[PDB]
Specification:
Elements lengths: L4 E8 L6 E2 L5 E13 L1 H4 L6 H8 L3 H10 L6 E7 L1 H8 L6 E10 L7 H4 L11 H5 L1 H5 L3 E8 L4 E9 L7 E2 L4 H18 L3 E8 L5 E7 L12 H4 L2 H4 L9 H10 L8 E3 L4 E4 L2 E4 L7 E3 H6 L3 H11 L1 H11 L25 H8 L8 H12 L3 E2 L14 E2 L3 H16 L15 E6 L3 E8 L6 E8 L13 H14 L11
Parallel strand pairs: 2-8
Antiparallel strand pairs: 1-6, 2-3, 3-4, 3-5, 6-7, 9-10, 9-19, 11-14, 12-13, 15-16, 17-18, 18-19
Helix pairs in contact: 2-3, 8-18, 11-13, 11-14, 11-17, 13-15
PDB class: peptide binding protein
Keywords: penicillin-binding protein, peptidoglycan, Transpeptidase, peptide binding protein
Assembly: monomeric
Amino acid sequence: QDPARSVRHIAIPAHRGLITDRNGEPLAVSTPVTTLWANPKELMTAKERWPQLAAALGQDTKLFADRIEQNAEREFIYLVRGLTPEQGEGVIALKVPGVYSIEEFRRFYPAGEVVAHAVGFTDVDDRGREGIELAFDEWLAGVPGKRQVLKDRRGRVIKDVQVTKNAKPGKTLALSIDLRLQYLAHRELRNALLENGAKAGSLVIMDVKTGEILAMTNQPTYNPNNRRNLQPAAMRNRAMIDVFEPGSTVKPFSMSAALASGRWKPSDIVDVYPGTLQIGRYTIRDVSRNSRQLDLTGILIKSSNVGISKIAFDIGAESIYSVMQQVGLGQDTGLGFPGERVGNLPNHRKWPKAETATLAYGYGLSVTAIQLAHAYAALANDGKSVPLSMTRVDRVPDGVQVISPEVASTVQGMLQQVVEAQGGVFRAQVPGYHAAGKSGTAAYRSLFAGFAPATDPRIAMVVVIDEPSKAGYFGGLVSAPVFSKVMAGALRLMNVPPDNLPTA
């Protein structure tokens, strides 16, 4: 016979660590629940109790009975996982022979859909599946304990023996996300999609000095507390997973290389007439073709592919590739989110003219919205690229000085003109502040990337609107007004003073 007594092991689930926003607002909270297990050998002695037990478990009478009967020779099965503690005590109070309980936890997400992708969610086993819950799973999960119970020959629990290993609680995590800014970004991106009839979109806000991600929202979104019917489209963390060719939004990096070469200054003029440039078989074409001479700021205002290409041929692709690589376009962010996409930054030993030109005006490389925002953050932070963080930064790390402060300041002023000057991106203007930025077109994505205050930058932001299909309230670039609204609120939520003084 089997021994009259045996010492069996039961895991002790650990309490998963609290996730908060940067201000301590709870974002993911472990909630006590009760799991019930049973010894079928004992249940088989108390069959008249089964229907009441099945009812208390929310299970069908006959499906429940079938399950016990088919497991009659086992000494352990789960009856139900994750009942409320109240529902649990109700089941336990039936006093059915062979019914036992385990204290576990399940997550609740107080901000729900507002921060769905960034926070992510746990699986049925309380394990991180998406977002920060996934990226920091080991930190948040801790380590289960193990305890021993004395059982008899038929698996009846006689008593607790001891705990052999205590559970190590999961550890707390404060995100860089500011829920105040995340709500503003979530609301405005949702409104922009509705008014533009768009498929999807993303918005990222970064602190340019600290590398912190202050907001990251995508549409569609979902309620992580109720995923019954959640469609895969909604679950996608587009800001980190969708790659696209950034188009004219990378011209400022080409310009930074031009100004660093020693060969170009902002007042220089390039003749871009007639809005095309033939290089062998290939023709470089501007979208708008109403220009002849443009200064360097003009090339940006007009999104002149021709103009930036002539500059690129003069300075060489290598110098542009170097800046783009160093600011992180097509490069690992270091954020450690499994499944994050890196995109691609093409390299060559001998750069063909077509590849040089297209790199310079943003085709042939592919990036994510996070990378684009980090790149603009370096430009905004006087050329210093601080590593990205999704967690609160108290001690600011050194950044790599990727662009000289002087070149960065010059480009900031050019991008301020892109927003402010006649012919520029009118609806990107941020009332009460000077803002700086650049539009582009990634079945298209509308892109806007920028920062503010333009003369002393604090915040960088990228807006991506995927496949707009309906006319919005304002004309012009679809993503521009979203930048305007979100930047206006974010700057004020952060108490950033206006930089548009009357000449002081």
